[PDB]
Design a protein around this ligand. Structure first.
Ligand SMILES: [Zn+2]
Ligand SMILES: [Zn+2]
Length: 67
């Protein structure tokens, strides 16, 4: 077991005791988990990455810079 989960760099709720159901995004640069909903990630757009063969990479706000 990894015993990890990371937390959204914006707010990530607080501690996140329900990260299992906590729609978080796994970054491709630092592998950091960003809030799917809080990061303003649309479900459809979020679905497109999840439907892809992993060719893409989800980059978090810090990695994506410009903020
Ligand atoms: Zn958040
Ligand atoms: Zn990142």
């Amino acid at each position: 077991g990894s015993a990890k989960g990371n937390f959204c760099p914006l707010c990530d709720k607080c501690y996140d005791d329900d990260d299992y159901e906590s729609k978080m995004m796994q970054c491709g640069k630092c592998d950091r988990w960003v809030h799917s909903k809080c990061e303003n990630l649309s479900d459809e757009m979020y679905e497109i990455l999840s439907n892809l063969p992993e060719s893409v990479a989800y980059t978090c706000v810090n990695c994506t810079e410009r903020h």
